[PDB]
Structures are given as C-alpha cells and as structure tokens.
Amino acid sequence: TVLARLDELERFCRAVFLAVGTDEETADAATRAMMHGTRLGVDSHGVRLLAHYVTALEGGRLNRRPQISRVSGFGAVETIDADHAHGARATYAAMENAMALAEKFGIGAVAIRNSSHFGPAGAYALEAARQGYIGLAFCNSDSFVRLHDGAMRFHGTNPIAVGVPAADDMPWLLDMATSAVPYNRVLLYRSLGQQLPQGVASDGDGVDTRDPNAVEMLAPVGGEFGFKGAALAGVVEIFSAVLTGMRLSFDLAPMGGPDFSTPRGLGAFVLALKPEAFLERDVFDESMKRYLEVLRGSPAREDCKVMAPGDREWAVAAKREREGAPVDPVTRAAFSELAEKFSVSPPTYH
Amino acid sequence: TVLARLDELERFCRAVFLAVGTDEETADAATRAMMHGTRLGVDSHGVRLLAHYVTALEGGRLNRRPQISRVSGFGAVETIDADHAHGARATYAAMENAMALAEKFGIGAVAIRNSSHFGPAGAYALEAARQGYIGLAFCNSDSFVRLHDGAMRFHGTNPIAVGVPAADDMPWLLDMATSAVPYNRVLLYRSLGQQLPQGVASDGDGVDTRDPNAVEMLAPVGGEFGFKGAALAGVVEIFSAVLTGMRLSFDLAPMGGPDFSTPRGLGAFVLALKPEAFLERDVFDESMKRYLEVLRGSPAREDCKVMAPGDREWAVAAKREREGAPVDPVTRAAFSELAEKFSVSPPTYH
Numbered sequence A, B: 001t002v003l004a005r006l007d008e009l010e011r012f013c014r015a016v017f018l019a020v021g022t023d024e025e026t027a028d029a030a031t032r033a034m035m036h037g038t039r040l041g042v043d044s045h046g047v048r049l050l051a052h053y054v055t056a057l058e059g060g061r062l063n064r065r066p067q068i069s070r071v072s073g074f075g076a077v078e079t080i081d082a083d084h085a086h087g088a089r090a091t092y093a094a095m096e097n098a099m100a101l102a103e104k105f106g107i108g109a110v111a112i113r114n115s116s117h118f119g120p121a122g123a124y125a126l127e128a129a130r131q132g133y134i135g136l137a138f139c140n141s142d143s144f145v146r147l148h149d150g151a152m153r154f155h156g157t158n159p160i161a162v163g164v165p166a167a168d169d170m171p172w173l174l175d176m177a178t179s180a181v182p183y184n185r186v187l188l189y190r191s192l193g194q195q196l197p198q199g200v201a202s203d204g205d206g207v208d209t210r211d212p213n214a215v216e217m218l219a220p221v222g223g224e225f226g227f228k229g230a231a232l233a234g235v236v237e238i239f240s241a242v243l244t245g246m247r248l249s250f251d252l253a254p255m256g257g258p259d260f261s262t263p264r265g266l267g268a269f270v271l272a273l274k275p276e277a278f279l280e281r282d283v284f285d286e287s288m289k290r291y292l293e294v295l296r297g298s299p300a301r302e303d304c305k306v307m308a309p310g311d312r313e314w315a316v317a318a319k320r321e322r323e324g325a326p327v328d329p330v331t332r333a334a335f336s337e338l339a340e341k342f343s344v345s346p347p348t349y350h
C-alpha cells in the first residue's frame, strides 16, 4: 500500500477517460465525482470506480458522447434526458441547471432521465453548496435493501445528499445511503472474514445476521424503527423513479456484469435553494455559524466526539491535501495495466 | 374508556376555539390538524392537544386573530410571517400558497415565520397530496434529542412529512420524528412503569437506558448509525430555523409551561411539487400504482406484514370512520369541564 497525489490521480483518471474516446466534459465530470469520493474518504465511491466506468464505457453501457437535453420544463422545473450519459456528467449538468433556475425563481428542481451510476451523491450536493445554494440529490439503484420486516431485496441503497453553504469554512454536507450501511461493506467483511455490525443486514428469510456470507439483503436505517429508513428510501424512489419515468429499484438491471452493453436507464433528482430568496444572507450565515459552533461544542459521551455532517470528510480531505490519498497494492496494479493499455502515464507514488 | 364520532369531536374542538375568541379560520385550521391525528391514530398529536392550545391562547402565547403576511418572495418562493398564529393556521395557509406557487412554477417553497406548534406534520403534507401535489413539511422544537455520541438534548424531534398523491386510493404519507421515537413515549412508559425499547433514549451521560425515569434526552433514528438520524434532524433544522430566521432548537423556549404568554417564535418550512410539470400524470400514477402494488405484495418475515408509509394510518382511519375514535376517561373529563367553562355541547359518546 502507498500514497498518491490528488492531482496525480485526477489527471490520470481524466487521461484514461479521454483515451476511451470519451467527451471532454464527460471526462471532467466523471473524474470530479471520483476525486470527490477519494478526497473525502468515501473510497467506496472513489477512484477505484475507474475500472468499472471504463468497462461500462467500452461495453457500451455508458455513452462516451452524451447529448444532454431537456424534454420539457416550465417555471422552475424541467426534466433532462442525459442520453445514457455517465452519472456524474448527467447529474453535474442537471445541478448547474437547478442552480440557474434557483437564481431565477429562488428554487430549481430537475428530474434526470436515462442516466447511470453517479458515484457519491454528495458530489452534486456539495457543488451547489460551493456555489452558495442548498443542493439536494436523490437516486436509486438495483434492489439491495429490504423493507422493515421484509424478506426480499426491495429498494436500492437509495442515497440522500444535502449540501448547505457555510460561512468561512467548509459547507454542511450529508451524503448517506438509506440503508444502515452501504453494500460494499458486506463484501469487505466477507473478504476479511469478520462479522458485520448488528442490524445492518439480513439472510434470505428476512431475519438479521452478522455473518457476511449469509447476507442476502441490507437492512433499513433505524433498526427496530427501520420502517423510518425504509420510508426515506421511499421518498427518494418517488423523486428518482416515479417522478422521472425511469424504472423502480426492483425493475433496474444489475450494477455489475455480465452485461456492460445494455443501458440501465437510471433516474435521479436534483434540487437547489437560493438562501437570498428567503432571507438576508447575513442572517443566514450567522444562524448557520451559531448552529455549527454550538453543535461541535456540544457535550459528548465518554471519550467520544460530536460533529456535523461532513466534518469527518473535511478532516480526511485536509489530510489527503498534504499527505495524499492511500492506494492499496491491487488498485495500483489496475492503474498500471490501464496505463499500459491506453498509453497514459500512471500516477507517481510515495 | 369509550368511543366518539369524528364529527362530534370535530364540531366540539371548533366550538371551543371560537369560544376562546379565536378566528374562524384559526378554529378550522386547528381542528383539522387535531382531527388529522385522531383519525390517523397518531393520538399523541390528536384532540388531546386541545387542552394545551386553549391554554396557550388564553395565556396569550397563541394569537387568536393572526394576520398572516408575506414579508417577501420572488419566483416560486416566499417567506410568510404568521403573526404568532397557531401552528396549524400558519402552516395550512403556507401550504395553500406553496400549492398556488407550484401551479405556476412547478414547485412552491414557503418559509414560515413567527409560528407555533402545529401538531402532526403530516396534516399539511397530506393536504397537498389530496390536492394532487407532493408536499413536504419541516419544523423544529425545543431540544430533546442528542447528536450521535452526544451528552445533551440538542435537536428537537424535528419531524419530516412527505405526502404523495396515489391514484384510486389514499395518498402515500410519511410523518416521522427524526428521533427513533417521539418524546411523549417516555412519559407514557414512565406512567405505566415499563422500560423503553433499546436505543430510543439516553441518560444524562449520553449512554442509552431503557428506564423511562433515567431518560434525559431522546436518541436519533439509526442506533449505531444514529448519526444519519441526527444529520436528518439537521436538514430540517436548516429549513426550519436557519432559512426562516427563527430560533434553533436549543434557543427555543419550552413547549410546556409555566409561560403560556410569551410567544416562542417557531419556524417551519413548506414545499409543493406539481407532478404534471415533470411528466405525464398518466405515467406518474401507473408508476406509483405499480410501486405500491409490488411493495404491499413483497415477501415478509415470519408472521409479519410489509406496508408503505401511511398504510397503518389508513387502516385505523377507516376503523375510526365507522366505529369512532376512542376517548379515555381522563380526556373525556377534560372535555366536560371545557364544555362547562365555554358553554359548548360536549361530544356524544358510546
């Protein structure tokens, strides 16, 4: 295992995408979503996803040159057809539009059609926050999580991402799957041979299990009150599938192979709020400032620490700014054969 | 204990409010919110709240004749100043506005100022659903729930309510506090002398306890992953307080006495979506129909049943339509003295 510079990894991912014969904007957008994940420590959706995207692109699943267009739209809303684009491209574009509409109507909501996996949901949410708007991001995926008291994979890990501008620091940022823990976690624990935390997954009968080998579905967030987490996965499902026209979780094709050619037709939803359309920006920042000052200063349990959403990510982000992002041996090896294959320089390490 | 007709209770609540010298619209709005809770089985926020509202009105906390006005607003947004109105009046009014803005811009968002406790958050969300829009409702309250790993009451029970139109049945409705369970639950368990479920509350040290007498704060939804529940309470806090200009949870005055004269200045947020602004309503209903058809038909655990958000509320709602709402002896006795006091007919029983 070893470290890599965030620019070294960035320039590398973009170089590879271009080599696959991808759009210049599709390459920039796809690398931002992965650099976002890698910079914020959410490595499950970091640069390790490069391998998959190039396979989906070469396979035909992801369109190299997507023509993003608005099928309709009136007022502060509009539905966009990404043209089977790479999730990040389809959603980064949808958000710049939602921000544009928010600048004109105080708010902006955009339904996304014919898209794909977009990596970390917070990428787009954090984009709006960096711009001074409140960004929302919903989406679904192939069924993985059961309902409360369920005995089958029902909803996808249907994430929720909310980004709020700060003042003189990093934006408030929530990026979470509606299930207790994401799916890659069971694969990781299965790989290490360790048991999962209690109430994160269930067997085929709907009864929880801490054995990663017996898991056949993820459990909703909330535990005994998991029905609340299942309900949250419902709101995202409505904004991501019923309101976009795309297929529901249980109707979507697998995220993995063997098919890397037939498009999945994934739906998503983006939302932006213009703080200045409701109140004085000076009173918004002082409230947010006070809100965060108090939160972080709040009493904690024994040897514990309290933090706002995004605080853990800004701590690792700062560390990866100077120290660099860790790249294990097997992902590094994948970077070498990708570099060999596409004739691009591999990331320098240390 | 005995039963009461939903019209008998409805007419009674309205009668009492008018007797206190309240607005005609403030009486209708306040009785709908309570009738909503009583009809849907969420009795914690039903007609048992009458006793408190008349006390807040007579005390001077709640304005009997509120002048709801929009301080500003451009595009599909606007901030409304309820003029210290009863919660239901301030929010039912803000929702009809958000619906009005949604009919014109596809969406409608309204920031509510100088409001008060509005009973069940689903009342307003369900209103938009009955109207054919997708309604959202956010609000905070005085601190009761701790942060993940916290050792102090931080957020209020900050509820989330989302109502989505169905097709040929009752709307999809989510109404849930961000905390695992609402506060009144500790009072009930303390009253019965029984222990609470694991992970719903904590003592003064931030460590969970099932003893309702040792509880000093509620726990976020999610358990070990309660940080997601605390992050959700954060999004509502931002929409309900930082975005409205109203006080944050920890700055708000108590919901109970002894002060029933000084206004709390509670904030809230309302949102409305016009499905027709994104797609053909015929494809929205067929997707929602299929979504619910499959959900309810999904496989369940041993002797369990799966249901969508609101399904449990529509089962008791139907039961309370014909059979009637149960009223215990002590709440009925409060109705008798309220009837005696204001010279209004008490609900007929059976």
Ligand SMILES: NC(=O)c1ccc[n+]([C@@H]2O[C@H](COP(=O)([O-])OP(=O)(O)OC[C@H]3O[C@@H](n4cnc5c(N)ncnc54)[C@H](O)[C@@H]3O)[C@@H](O)[C@H]2O)c1
Pocket (backbone or CB within 6 Å): A042, A044, A045, A117, A118, A119, A120, A121, A122, A139, A140, A141, A157, A158, A159, A173, A174, A175, A176, A177, A178, A180, A181, A182, A306, A307, A308, A309, A310, A311, A312, A313, B148, B149, B227, B228, B231
């Ligand atoms: N593209 C897709 O289809 C898809 C689907 C599912 C998940 N994802 C991604 O998976 C990634 C991980 O999701 P997750 O739910 O496992 O993340 P997580 O459970 O690790 O954390 C989610 C949230 O809780 C916060 N948090 C964690 N610990 C905390 C603490 N101690 N105190 C306060 N807050 C704390 C985090 O900042 C974060 O906002 C996300 O980036 C998500 O977008 C993507």
Ligand SMILES: NC(=O)c1ccc[n+]([C@@H]2O[C@H](COP(=O)([O-])OP(=O)(O)OC[C@H]3O[C@@H](n4cnc5c(N)ncnc54)[C@H](O)[C@@H]3O)[C@@H](O)[C@H]2O)c1
Pocket (backbone or CB within 6 Å): A148, A227, A228, A231, B042, B044, B045, B117, B118, B119, B120, B121, B122, B139, B140, B141, B157, B158, B159, B173, B174, B175, B176, B177, B178, B180, B181, B182, B306, B307, B308, B309, B310, B311, B312, B313
């Ligand atoms: N006015 C305020 O300031 C305020 C503050 C907090 C809470 N409240 C009110 O408290 C009331 C109760 O909130 P709560 O969170 O305790 O309710 P709850 O936990 O009983 O239920 C919330 C949700 O989960 C769903 N649900 C329950 N069991 C289910 C199952 N088996 N399968 C699928 N779904 C299921 C319910 O339909 C509901 O939408 C709400 O009406 C809320 O608005 C008001």
